[PDB]
Amino acid sequence: AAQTNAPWGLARISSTSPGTSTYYYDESAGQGSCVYVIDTGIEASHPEFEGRAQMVKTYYYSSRDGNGHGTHCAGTVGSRTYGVAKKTQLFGVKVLDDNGSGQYSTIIAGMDFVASDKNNRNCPKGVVASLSLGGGYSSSVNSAAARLQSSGVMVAVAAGNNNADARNYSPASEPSVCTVGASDRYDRRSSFSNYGSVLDIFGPGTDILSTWIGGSTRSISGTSMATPHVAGLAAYLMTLGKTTAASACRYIADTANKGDLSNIPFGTVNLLAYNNYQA
Ligand SMILES: [Ca+2]
User: Fold this and answer.
1) Cβ(126)–Cβ(153) under 8 Å?
2) Which terms does the record give in the GO molecular function aspect?
3) 3-class DSSP state for residue 254?
4) From ligand 1's centre to the CA of 268, what distance in Å?
């Protein structure tokens, strides 16, 4: 399948090269997989989700995304225009209030929630979780990411936005999950991407068009926008049969565009997520 005049990041993770605008992909498109967006919530009523999205948890007084962040990240995963995995099932978990603030202990609660709940869902092709959030190093936050991953969920986490080595941030520094940095449409590291040997992969994160609340769209920027490209990609690769929740971060790295970003500080991977469909 081909989707012309696509947001640049969907074209990128289907290209070897920058500078084009079609998103080339296999039509199975994540059918039979499940992606949990653990964030401010998802405006499931957005027609771009077409009935595939459900809130299933909150730790606040409403499950609604009253911020838009969770809805945008979820759209990149799996909205019909703006998504990687256009036919995946989306499940929301609201661990952030309507300003973007979550206490750690609640974010932990969300995470163990997914390891349990996946067992309440129909996900024959595999389960992913997408965490576009974080704060300073915590062993506990990191332990809750290793548990979620160990429970057979592909876990994708934002490396962070301080232009700093990510080993000091959580859940990014955790080893066993898939820590995602951000790039731009000219294959530069985005100016705000954390970096450091704990990163596994880079995805598109600067001027990412996606869904927003009210039924609407916007473009924003962050390792948060990069993260759901890798989550959605992993859902897409499960569904096909290329990899598994426990193997997907390694498979994506193995199949990435290798060398191609400029400003990878020394010691940071120079790997860019790629679906290997068109070549
Ligand atoms: Ca890893």
Assistant:
1) no
2) metal ion binding; serine-type endopeptidase activity
3) helix
4) 14
The method of structure determination was X-ray
Residue 200 labelled as part of a binding site: yes
Is residue 171 reached through a cis peptide bond, with omega within 30 degrees of 0 on the bond before it? Answer: yes
Resolution of this entry, Å:
1.0
Rg of the chain (C-alpha set):
16
> What is the rounded (10 degree) CA torsion for 174, 177, 179, 185?
180
> If you measure from the C-alpha of residue 2 to the centroid of ligand 1, how many angstroms do you get, rounded to a whole number?
30
Q: Domain coordinates of the chain in residue numbers? A: 1-279
Helix or strand run (H / E) with residue 248: helix 248-254
94 beta partners: 39, 58
Fold for 1-279, please state it: Rossmann fold (3.40.50)
| Residue 116 neighbours by CB distance under 10 Å | 9
Has 124 been labeled as part of a binding site? no
Point out the residues that are catalytic: 39, 69, 224
Residue 14 amino acid letter: S
Interval between CA 186 and ligand 1 midpoint (Å) = 26
> 48 CA to middle of ligand 1, Å?
31
Of 254, 249, 246, which Cα lies nearest the Cα of 227? 249
Residues with CB under 5 A from ligand 1 (ion): 200, 249
User: How far does CA 73 lie from the centroid of its chain?
Assistant: 7
Q: Report the alpha-carbon distance of residue 196 to residue 146 in Å, rounded.
A: 19
Residue 7, annotated as binding a ligand: no
What is the spatial distance between Cα 171 and Cα 227, in angstroms, rounded to a whole number? Answer: 12
